[PDB]
Amino acid sequence: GRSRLLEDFRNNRYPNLQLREIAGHIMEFSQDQHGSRFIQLKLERATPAERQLVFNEILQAAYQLMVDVFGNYVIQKFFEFGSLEQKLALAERIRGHVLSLALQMYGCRVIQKALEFIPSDQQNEMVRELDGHVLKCVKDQNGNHVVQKCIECVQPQSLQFIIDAFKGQVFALSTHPYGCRVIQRILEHCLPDQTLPILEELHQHTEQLVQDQYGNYVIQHVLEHGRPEDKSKIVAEIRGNVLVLSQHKFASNVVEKCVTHASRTERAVLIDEVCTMNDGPHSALYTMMKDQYANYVVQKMIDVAEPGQRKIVMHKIRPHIATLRKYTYGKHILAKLEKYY
C-alpha cells in the first residue's frame, strides 16, 4: 500500500533525497522500515526549522507512531534533541494513554524516553496515570521497565503511590523476575522515609529470600548499599547458618557480602562461627575451602579477618593443603595461605 515516492525511495531512486522533499509523506515514511531510518538520520543533522517541518506531520497522529514498530523511533528522537515546546506537545498527546503505552511493546519506549527528558511538572502528570496499576506494570515484561524509569528520573515524593502499592507485597515481588529489579531501584532512589516500610517487610522474610533465585539479589543490595542498622539485621539472620548457606547456590553470595560489609565486630563473629565449628568428622573450614560456592566466603574471610583471627583460620587450613592443591574451587585460598608461610 506504499506510495510511488516511497517505493521509489526503496528502489534507491533518490541517493540524495532530502527531508524538505518528502514533505507531506513524513507519516508514511515514519512507518516504513527504511523511510523511518532515513528520517532518523536526516533529523540527526538537520536544522531546527527543518525538524519543525517534520514535527508538524507527526504531531496529530503521534499516538499511532508511538505504538508503531518503526515510528517509535521518530517520536523518540524529538524527546532527545527536540525543543521544549515539541516535547510538551508530545507529552500532551500522551496524556491519557500512559498506561496502555507503558505496557506496549513499542510505546513503553517512548514513555521511558519521555520520562528522561520532560520537566518535573510534566513527569508528575505522566506518573499519576499509573496509580492503581503499579503491580500490573511491574509484572509486565514492558511495564516493569517503565515503573523502573520513573523511580530513576522522577522526584521521589511523586512516587509515593509506588511505595504504598508494595504494601504487603515485598516478599511476593522479591521472588518475582521483574519485581526484584524494581525493588532494588526503590532501595537506590526512594527517600529514607519511603524505604523504611519496604526494608521492614524484607527483614521479615530475610531467610527465605537469601535462598531464592531473585531474593538473594535484593538482600545483597541492602548489604552493599544499605544503612548499618539494616546490614546488622541481615547478618543476624545469617548467623548460626554460615556453613550451610555458604554452600547454597544462592545464599552463599549473601554470606559473601556479609563478611565483606558487616561491622568489624560482626565480621569477627562470622569467622569465629566457622572456625570454632566442625562439620562432619571434619573441620568446618575444610568443607568450605573445597566447595564450589563456599570457597569464596573463606577468601572473603581471610581478607577481612584481623591478625589474631586471621592466623587462626590459616592454622585451620594448613593441615589440608595437599588436599586443597588439587581443587581448582581451592586455588585462591591456598594462594592466600602461602602469602605468609
Added chain:
RNA sequence: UUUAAUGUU
C-alpha cells in the same frame, strides 16, 4: 572456580 529480565529499528 561464583545466580539473576526470553524488555524494538
